Amino acid sequence: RESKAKQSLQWEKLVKRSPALAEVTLDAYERTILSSIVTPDEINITFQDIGGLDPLISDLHESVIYPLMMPEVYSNSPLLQAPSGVLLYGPPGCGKTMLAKALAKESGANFISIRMSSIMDKWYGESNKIVDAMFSLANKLQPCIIFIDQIDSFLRERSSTDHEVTATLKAEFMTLWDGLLNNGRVMIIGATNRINDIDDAFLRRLPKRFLVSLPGSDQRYKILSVLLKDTKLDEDEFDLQLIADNTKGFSGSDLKELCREAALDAAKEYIKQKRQPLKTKDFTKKL
Amino acid sequence: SRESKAKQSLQWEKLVKRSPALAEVTLDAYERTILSSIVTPDEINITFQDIGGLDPLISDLHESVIYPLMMPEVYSNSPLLQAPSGVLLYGPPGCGKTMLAKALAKESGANFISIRMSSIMDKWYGESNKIVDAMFSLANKLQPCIIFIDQIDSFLRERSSTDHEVTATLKAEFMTLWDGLLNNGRVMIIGATNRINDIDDAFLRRLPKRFLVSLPGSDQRYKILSVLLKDTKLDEDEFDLQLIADNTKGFSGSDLKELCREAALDAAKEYIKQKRQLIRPLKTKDFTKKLRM
Amino acid sequence: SRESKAKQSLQWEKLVKRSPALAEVTLDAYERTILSSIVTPDEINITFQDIGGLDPLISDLHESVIYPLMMPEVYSNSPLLQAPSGVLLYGPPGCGKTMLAKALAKESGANFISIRMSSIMDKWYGESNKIVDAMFSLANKLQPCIIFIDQIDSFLRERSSTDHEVTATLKAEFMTLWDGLLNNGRVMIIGATNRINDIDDAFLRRLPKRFLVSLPGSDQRYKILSVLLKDTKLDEDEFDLQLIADNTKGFSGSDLKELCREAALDAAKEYIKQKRQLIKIRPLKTKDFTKKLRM
Amino acid sequence: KSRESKAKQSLQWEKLVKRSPALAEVTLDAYERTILSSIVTPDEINITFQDIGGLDPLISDLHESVIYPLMMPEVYSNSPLLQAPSGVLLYGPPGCGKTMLAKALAKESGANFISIRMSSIMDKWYGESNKIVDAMFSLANKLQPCIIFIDQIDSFLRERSSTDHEVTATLKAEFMTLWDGLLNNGRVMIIGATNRINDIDDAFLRRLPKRFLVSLPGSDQRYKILSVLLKDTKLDEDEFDLQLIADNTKGFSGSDLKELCREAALDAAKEYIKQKRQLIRPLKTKDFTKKLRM
Amino acid sequence: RESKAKQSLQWEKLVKRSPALAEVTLDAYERTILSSIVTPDEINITFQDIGGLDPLISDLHESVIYPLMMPEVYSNSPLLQAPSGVLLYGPPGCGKTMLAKALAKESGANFISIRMSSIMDKWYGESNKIVDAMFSLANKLQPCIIFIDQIDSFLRERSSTDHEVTATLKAEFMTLWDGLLNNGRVMIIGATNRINDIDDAFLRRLPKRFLVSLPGSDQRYKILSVLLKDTKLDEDEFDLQLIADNTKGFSGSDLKELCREAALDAAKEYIKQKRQLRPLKTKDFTKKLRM
Amino acid sequence: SRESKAKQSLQWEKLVKRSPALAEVTLDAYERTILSSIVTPDEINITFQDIGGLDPLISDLHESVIYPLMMPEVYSNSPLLQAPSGVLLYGPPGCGKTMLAKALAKESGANFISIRMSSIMDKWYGESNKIVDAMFSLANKLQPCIIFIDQIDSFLRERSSTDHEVTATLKAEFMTLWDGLLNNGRVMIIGATNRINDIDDAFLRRLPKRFLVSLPGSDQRYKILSVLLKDTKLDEDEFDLQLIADNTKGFSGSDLKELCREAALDAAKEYIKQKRQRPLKTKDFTKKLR
Amino acid sequence: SLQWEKLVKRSPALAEVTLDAYERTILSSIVTPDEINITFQDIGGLDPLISDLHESVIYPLMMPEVYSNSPLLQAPSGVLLYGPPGCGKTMLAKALAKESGANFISIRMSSIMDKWYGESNKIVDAMFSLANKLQPCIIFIDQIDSFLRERSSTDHEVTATLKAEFMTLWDGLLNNGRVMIIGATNRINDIDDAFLRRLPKRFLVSLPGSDQRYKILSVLLKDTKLDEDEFDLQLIADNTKGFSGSDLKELCREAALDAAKEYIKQRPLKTKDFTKKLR
Numbered sequence A: 001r002e003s004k005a006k007q008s009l010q011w012e013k014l015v016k017r018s019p020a021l022a023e024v025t026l027d028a029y030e031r032t033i034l035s036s037i038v039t040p041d042e043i044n045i046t047f048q049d050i051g052g053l054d055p056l057i058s059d060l061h062e063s064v065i066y067p068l069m070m071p072e073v074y075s076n077s078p079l080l081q082a083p084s085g086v087l088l089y090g091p092p093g094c095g096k097t098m099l100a101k102a103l104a105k106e107s108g109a110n111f112i113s114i115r116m117s118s119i120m121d122k123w124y125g126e127s128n129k130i131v132d133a134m135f136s137l138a139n140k141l142q143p144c145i146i147f148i149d150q151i152d153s154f155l156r157e158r159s160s161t162d163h164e165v166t167a168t169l170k171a172e173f174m175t176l177w178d179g180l181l182n183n184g185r186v187m188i189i190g191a192t193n194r195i196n197d198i199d200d201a202f203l204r205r206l207p208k209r210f211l212v213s214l215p216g217s218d219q220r221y222k223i224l225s226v227l228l229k230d231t232k233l234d235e236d237e238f239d240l241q242l243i244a245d246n247t248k249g250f251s252g253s254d255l256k257e258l259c260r261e262a263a264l265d266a267a268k269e270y271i272k273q274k275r276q277p278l279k280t281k282d283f284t285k286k287l
Numbered sequence B: 001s002r003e004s005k006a007k008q009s010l011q012w013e014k015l016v017k018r019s020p021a022l023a024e025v026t027l028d029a030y031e032r033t034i035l036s037s038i039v040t041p042d043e044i045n046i047t048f049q050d051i052g053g054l055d056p057l058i059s060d061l062h063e064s065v066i067y068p069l070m071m072p073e074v075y076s077n078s079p080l081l082q083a084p085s086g087v088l089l090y091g092p093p094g095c096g097k098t099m100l101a102k103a104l105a106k107e108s109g110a111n112f113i114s115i116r117m118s119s120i121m122d123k124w125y126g127e128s129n130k131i132v133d134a135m136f137s138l139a140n141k142l143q144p145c146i147i148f149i150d151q152i153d154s155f156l157r158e159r160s161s162t163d164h165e166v167t168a169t170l171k172a173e174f175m176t177l178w179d180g181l182l183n184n185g186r187v188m189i190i191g192a193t194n195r196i197n198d199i200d201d202a203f204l205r206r207l208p209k210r211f212l213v214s215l216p217g218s219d220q221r222y223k224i225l226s227v228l229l230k231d232t233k234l235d236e237d238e239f240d241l242q243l244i245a246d247n248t249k250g251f252s253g254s255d256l257k258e259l260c261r262e263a264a265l266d267a268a269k270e271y272i273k274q275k276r277q278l279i280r281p282l283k284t285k286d287f288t289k290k291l292r293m
Numbered sequence C: 001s002r003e004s005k006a007k008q009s010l011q012w013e014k015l016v017k018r019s020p021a022l023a024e025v026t027l028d029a030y031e032r033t034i035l036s037s038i039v040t041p042d043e044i045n046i047t048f049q050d051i052g053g054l055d056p057l058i059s060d061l062h063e064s065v066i067y068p069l070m071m072p073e074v075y076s077n078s079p080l081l082q083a084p085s086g087v088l089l090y091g092p093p094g095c096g097k098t099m100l101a102k103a104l105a106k107e108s109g110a111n112f113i114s115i116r117m118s119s120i121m122d123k124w125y126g127e128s129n130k131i132v133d134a135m136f137s138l139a140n141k142l143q144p145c146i147i148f149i150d151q152i153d154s155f156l157r158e159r160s161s162t163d164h165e166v167t168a169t170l171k172a173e174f175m176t177l178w179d180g181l182l183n184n185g186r187v188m189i190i191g192a193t194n195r196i197n198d199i200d201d202a203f204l205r206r207l208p209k210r211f212l213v214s215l216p217g218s219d220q221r222y223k224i225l226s227v228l229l230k231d232t233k234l235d236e237d238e239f240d241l242q243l244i245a246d247n248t249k250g251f252s253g254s255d256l257k258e259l260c261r262e263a264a265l266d267a268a269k270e271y272i273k274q275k276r277q278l279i280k281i282r283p284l285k286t287k288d289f290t291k292k293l294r295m
Numbered sequence D: 001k002s003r004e005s006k007a008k009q010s011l012q013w014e015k016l017v018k019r020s021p022a023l024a025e026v027t028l029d030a031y032e033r034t035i036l037s038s039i040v041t042p043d044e045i046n047i048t049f050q051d052i053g054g055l056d057p058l059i060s061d062l063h064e065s066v067i068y069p070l071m072m073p074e075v076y077s078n079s080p081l082l083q084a085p086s087g088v089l090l091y092g093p094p095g096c097g098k099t100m101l102a103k104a105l106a107k108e109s110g111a112n113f114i115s116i117r118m119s120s121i122m123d124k125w126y127g128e129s130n131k132i133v134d135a136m137f138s139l140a141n142k143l144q145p146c147i148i149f150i151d152q153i154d155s156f157l158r159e160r161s162s163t164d165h166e167v168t169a170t171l172k173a174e175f176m177t178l179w180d181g182l183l184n185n186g187r188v189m190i191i192g193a194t195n196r197i198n199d200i201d202d203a204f205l206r207r208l209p210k211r212f213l214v215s216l217p218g219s220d221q222r223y224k225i226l227s228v229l230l231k232d233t234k235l236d237e238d239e240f241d242l243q244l245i246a247d248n249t250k251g252f253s254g255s256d257l258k259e260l261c262r263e264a265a266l267d268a269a270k271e272y273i274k275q276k277r278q279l280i281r282p283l284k285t286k287d288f289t290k291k292l293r294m
Numbered sequence E: 001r002e003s004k005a006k007q008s009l010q011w012e013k014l015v016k017r018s019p020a021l022a023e024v025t026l027d028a029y030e031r032t033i034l035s036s037i038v039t040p041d042e043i044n045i046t047f048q049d050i051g052g053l054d055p056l057i058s059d060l061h062e063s064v065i066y067p068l069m070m071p072e073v074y075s076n077s078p079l080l081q082a083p084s085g086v087l088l089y090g091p092p093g094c095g096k097t098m099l100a101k102a103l104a105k106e107s108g109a110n111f112i113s114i115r116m117s118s119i120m121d122k123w124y125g126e127s128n129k130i131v132d133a134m135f136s137l138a139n140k141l142q143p144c145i146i147f148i149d150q151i152d153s154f155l156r157e158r159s160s161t162d163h164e165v166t167a168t169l170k171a172e173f174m175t176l177w178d179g180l181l182n183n184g185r186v187m188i189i190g191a192t193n194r195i196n197d198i199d200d201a202f203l204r205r206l207p208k209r210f211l212v213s214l215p216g217s218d219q220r221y222k223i224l225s226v227l228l229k230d231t232k233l234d235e236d237e238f239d240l241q242l243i244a245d246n247t248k249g250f251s252g253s254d255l256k257e258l259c260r261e262a263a264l265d266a267a268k269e270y271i272k273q274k275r276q277l278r279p280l281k282t283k284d285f286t287k288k289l290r291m
Numbered sequence F: 001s002r003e004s005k006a007k008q009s010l011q012w013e014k015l016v017k018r019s020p021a022l023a024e025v026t027l028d029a030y031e032r033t034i035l036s037s038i039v040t041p042d043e044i045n046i047t048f049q050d051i052g053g054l055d056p057l058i059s060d061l062h063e064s065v066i067y068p069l070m071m072p073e074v075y076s077n078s079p080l081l082q083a084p085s086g087v088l089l090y091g092p093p094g095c096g097k098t099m100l101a102k103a104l105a106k107e108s109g110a111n112f113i114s115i116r117m118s119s120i121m122d123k124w125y126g127e128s129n130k131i132v133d134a135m136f137s138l139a140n141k142l143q144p145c146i147i148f149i150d151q152i153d154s155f156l157r158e159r160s161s162t163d164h165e166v167t168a169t170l171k172a173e174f175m176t177l178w179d180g181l182l183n184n185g186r187v188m189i190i191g192a193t194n195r196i197n198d199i200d201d202a203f204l205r206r207l208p209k210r211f212l213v214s215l216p217g218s219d220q221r222y223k224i225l226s227v228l229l230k231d232t233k234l235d236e237d238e239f240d241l242q243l244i245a246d247n248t249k250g251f252s253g254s255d256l257k258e259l260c261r262e263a264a265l266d267a268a269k270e271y272i273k274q275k276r277q278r279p280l281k282t283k284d285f286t287k288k289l290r
Numbered sequence G: 001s002l003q004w005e006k007l008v009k010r011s012p013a014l015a016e017v018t019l020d021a022y023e024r025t026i027l028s029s030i031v032t033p034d035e036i037n038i039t040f041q042d043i044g045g046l047d048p049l050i051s052d053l054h055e056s057v058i059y060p061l062m063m064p065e066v067y068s069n070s071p072l073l074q075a076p077s078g079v080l081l082y083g084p085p086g087c088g089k090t091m092l093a094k095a096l097a098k099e100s101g102a103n104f105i106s107i108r109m110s111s112i113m114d115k116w117y118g119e120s121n122k123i124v125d126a127m128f129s130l131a132n133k134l135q136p137c138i139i140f141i142d143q144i145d146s147f148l149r150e151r152s153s154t155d156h157e158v159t160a161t162l163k164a165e166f167m168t169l170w171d172g173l174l175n176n177g178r179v180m181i182i183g184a185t186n187r188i189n190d191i192d193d194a195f196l197r198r199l200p201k202r203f204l205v206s207l208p209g210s211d212q213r214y215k216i217l218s219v220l221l222k223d224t225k226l227d228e229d230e231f232d233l234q235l236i237a238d239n240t241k242g243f244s245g246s247d248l249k250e251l252c253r254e255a256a257l258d259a260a261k262e263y264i265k266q267r268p269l270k271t272k273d274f275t276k277k278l279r
Ligand SMILES: [Mg+2]
Pocket: A096, A097, B175, B176, B179, B180
């Protein structure tokens, strides 16, 4: 019911986006899996809301963005195609999933960001049908990004102690990942917080690795700059550099709460007027 | 079962009565079974002023957590003033972390999902991930939703090689729905634990707001004993709450409740033996008799 | 299984026989599996009169555990006069913790779920958590209920990262259903253990009423010997229970029962020999008892 | 389970039904069926109570305190303290005859015998070993006069510790609960043999009240053991001096004398077997003495 | 794949050796035990390759091998049975595993040369099942010898500090070795240097014990003569008795390297020519000898 | 760790590159994790020509270790011409045992499994014994293999009743696979130690070929100083290496290496200071010599 | 996280290094210059020792471009700072950490020790691996006589195995590039001969001389309440014969405490204040 309504709405948006999908024909499993296709309308974060990752944004535009959306520009050599696998890994909360958000927002390709419940199925045999529907829809709807959120759980360190169904699913993912690279505008992307849990064969299956590490001092400065945008601050009583060097060892999400929570205290009296500027002291008193 | 589905229907009726805007919306089957974990304020008999010794923590849990989530109209002047994505009520066992959850469920006005690990785990293949997806989808549908997972350390434990495939899959699915693509609305994932160090680093990241509900001090023990001894016969002269609070060194709130229960039982055994064969002003001697100093 | 289903049906029939109000209440499958651990008073042959030495402990257990649980009308004048959320019977082995549990299952009118951990733990994923959830739900349905876990130190052991996923989530689910958001009405979890220090701190705080069933004293040993030697001829002038009471230093209650077992066996060494040749009990004197322990 | 295991279970159930006709209506679940492969029928054991020498006071005490109270409850049903013990521990130095007594108990006590081993109890699956122990106790209750035997019981019922595996600690607690908790077993006795009594946990030692110390043999006990081992053998009428060997084998266990008898008889048969290999004799004391150090 | 192939190959070899084994079936754990079966083809050492221990070889035949392998000859008297255990103890290098190789090859017994890696498993209760299947397979291959080299670590003295899996493993080994269920012609052979490290119950489970001690002068001469088989030696300069006398305290390993080091230089002028593209001597051997 | 698996993959690639016939051999998981400890050539920057003062020892090591193992076709004419089951390089520290091990790794051509103790160690029950078993099985598969144990006195320590259960089981498993029933191929276990007496007696007899890398003499110290001062511009007339060698009484090769490091530092200190703003002589060596 | 962030900040090339869990627990003990508040100028009376430590420790290690004329000019495998206790070894290590530019892993015996079997071996292996991944690294052991004790047959198997694998990784096959060991102890004879060989550069931080005591005092009470004319520091240094650096700190603290007695109640420091606190 609601899944069918979401599928129809997503298909209407894709028809409005890509005119080449008017003649595109779909079976039951593919129609089922467009509910995982996300569009840049619901995503509210573009590439400009990420701070401290500007060189990584530059390598992103060089590797994942431009070759996928401008293959004619990157066609001087046959090996200039977009990579089959991109791994946006790093310590948790450093902005990898926001990088995926910005990819969906800015890159013209679709973002088929499935969720593991959608692929996973209780009836034996049907789960492989969901995987091949994923790959076939990704090939047929040509400009797209297969985003596999949390690459660690699926394609984990394989062993005989795991389920037979999950081993067959991993084998099929490897199988259609082999044919994934020869297709032009198709691509699989994973983003995770730990790398040791990734399967070594599947690690080889992602021949492009990104380093979303903990922010540095300059990266902390940029993160605090873009996190406090479109908010009312103060000029002389407030400074960001001392704050950035004070919050050493903090991921951007830890600064997100630090930006958020400390801004309540400076606005508690401001809220108290409706409940019934940011000094440099409010963020620092939260440390 | 039939009784289960009756409980799901009754919870849906209470949710519709609470928010009339929740009508004319549909739920999946998995969302429907997830709805059986909804706890409504009539189920909880614990009030915020039934918690003693945590008044600064009660105030902080109001201003930094409940008010930004409940009324975004006044916090919409700055989009950075929103509610946290997660709240952790950690501390030693005995303090009022779960009672904080009880009062927060009763009188925040937010839809409360008291999920348990039994309702999340399913023996069948891939159902648990669909259950967690349904939980987050229902939290999105009931827009001011709070999802409480008591004893959060077991659910969001550190990922390891010994972890079951379904468990690691469940944890990754929880992370994916918790933050990132297809972001939730006014959805809060509140956890309580007595072992904070057992929580995974990514899951610890997803709980940025952390409330340390530590062991009570002497004044905190006095406040806890005062709120526990409410609605009982006190002594205007012989009772000395300050002496009991001083002598109850290293006593958690549950330890003081048992001391209050044991003292009041001995303070009424003259009455109880009289009624059973068919109260009394409580004293410091009754409390200190069961107290070992 | 057929035998398990028959046991569940018989136990449910006994429960509705004991409490006629539990007829409209229905149960799911997991609660039906939990029902096979219900202990009816007819399954227990041990009364509180069969426990000696622990008479102050028995009286304290009654007035602080059983009467608040079974008579809320008497104790409803104060909100503090309630049964404990948990009771722990800890002490050295053989002193009578399981004896107290049997007398509690027989004497007190509360329905007794003497759950064993084999029925709790399941090899399938998430079944054990559902089993514990059903255990607590059935204890809620049979409103005055006692959930008994003998040797509770293994179930409620100290949590660690070396714990299995199933047992960690099982312990957490037990904590949540014990003292979490929803409140159990008149459910009371009672544990008998020998290693109290093995129990987790949160599980220990969920067992606030702790009973130390320690090793018997000389007067306690005399009381236990008098209880054990009931329905026995004994003697009148030669026998001296007091002398055995002093000589049994460090003897637990089970040590005295075994001591009484072989003492009565040697008293019957002449009578059984006549009876075995076929296919009156000789009066028991403390010469038979003293010859057993080498003091 | 394995096909050979299922065949053994079916054969054991047929043997138990034939021995006790009242067990036909008794039904078992899967776990009790796996326990059924540990049943030791008297035909499996070829060792008699008269094949044990030097333990006649211990054998008599074992009979009148273990076997007759369990196997003859109508004789002892006159006093509540005349019952069989809930468990029996056969302890002592190795080789003195603990397993000999257990084999005699398996053959000619009359109780159904479950010589369970720890490999049949432990399972790599979660909650399976506890169900195995529960089924072991349930099956022992169904075969009402039953003896559950655990050889080398010190490893099974070891002293509990925080370093114990959760499966092992849970297993020990379940064994304790079924051994003596609520819903007491009718006529189930847990007989155990060990040579490390101090390794047994205090609660488990509590559940084994009838302890039999099968100690090292004395001179007369060594004489009796040597006479039993040298039975249906030629020996001698004038040369052999069994008392000299009994005195000279100071500190010898029953197993040490069996090997000494084995080595002495081999030397006595060295000439005869040499003839037989290509295609006995009266044993003398010099055959035992030449292998003996004094 | 390789492990299962080894199990299959050992099973075909055992069926070829004994045709009665074709109709029997094995559990999965017994099949895992099958990979440790040692056939006489693998062993390249016989009883004639061991010198100095001719009385020990004769005793190991008469009291151990023949009662196990010829029960018809020994069945008239019930005391003439094979030992439940055999311990080959002594200082290292004297020929314990030499005798074990000769037992694996010359004696007609199936040989389970089990090691510790194939017994201990990390999963709960597998190791006990591995031991149970080892004894079950030894019973199915009825005249079996289970050889545990360096048995002092396996059957170590039990302590309260022992691991729970290790303690239950040792108890299961004791039960299947000498418990209620008698083992039919199953024999446990252990070689060790530290006999006192073995538990007393395990030591009593090994009744027949052979002390493979340091060689005497005559024993050293015999070992040197066996080691120098298929070697030119000499005719006039060679004096084996002087070498045997001057190798005081030398074990069989110490002579084997002495024979090796004396042969390296003896053929060295032949090797030096061969690398680009002789009879031995007493002085040659005396060069490495320290009198 | 992904780096560890990549290191095993690189070691395997270099192994099949060195030996083309090493292609159809399949490895278990434990053999694959032992494969990370392979020390291929050109991972070692030290040859036999870089070791001074050990020419008789190097020649004896060659003729008794390398050629009987690497070239069995020459030695097949006599059964006593086999390689030793083990080799022990013992002596006081700093005399060049690990130098000889590095030269064995680089120059012999044998596959070199220089396992450390942490590779063998495992917290899980039974895995360490499986690690040793797979190490020996892999050395059998890489048929002319040399397993090197640096600081062998701790791995093969004297067995005792106070030894840990896992370590005692490990040492017994190592002893069984070293010399028990199933004979190894062209597998040699070379070990270096400072305390030979700390090695167990059976582990010592499993190392029959013992090489004593003792403290250098006068001529040995002269050769060590000459090979240490190679590609270094010494003084043409003021230098006297024999005087330095005689003055370095009781000096190991590492002790001479530090003295050479000390003497070359303050010699070029003027050059280095001028760099940030040399004819090395005997007086610089005797400045740090007493 | 803090230490890894500082190591990334000091050199961006360290971000590309992939690490393991044991390497992360080693990263739990890498000491960064922000925690150190004491410089090389704080050490007095050891100017030739400081210059020798510079020219033979830090310049050969941190700037091998100007030390690449010969391979003989490389940094030593280890340095042992040994002498009378309380003489300046700890500040020598701390100032080397501050003014070296090298990552100063200061790890103790307690942090190496692990509960499970063989995990300490992997801790030591990942310590040396982490020092190898970030090449200009210094591993600091404090009181190395406790850790690198002389090997004995009575040693526990865990600690003997740890010491032997430390010797293997320190100077063994696959030699460590740019990995440096700083040793501080007061009992040089308690260290094993092989470990002592692994620290071939030795510094005698002995009891200060008269001029050394004068320099230590002059650095110690710099910018203090020192007298304009009535302070005979030479006489004080002569009186404190055979006084450790830690004794001079106690001497200066004791004299300043009595000199600030009027200030506590509310440049008066003189020779007699120092004289009354010495014999
Ligand atoms: Mg994410």
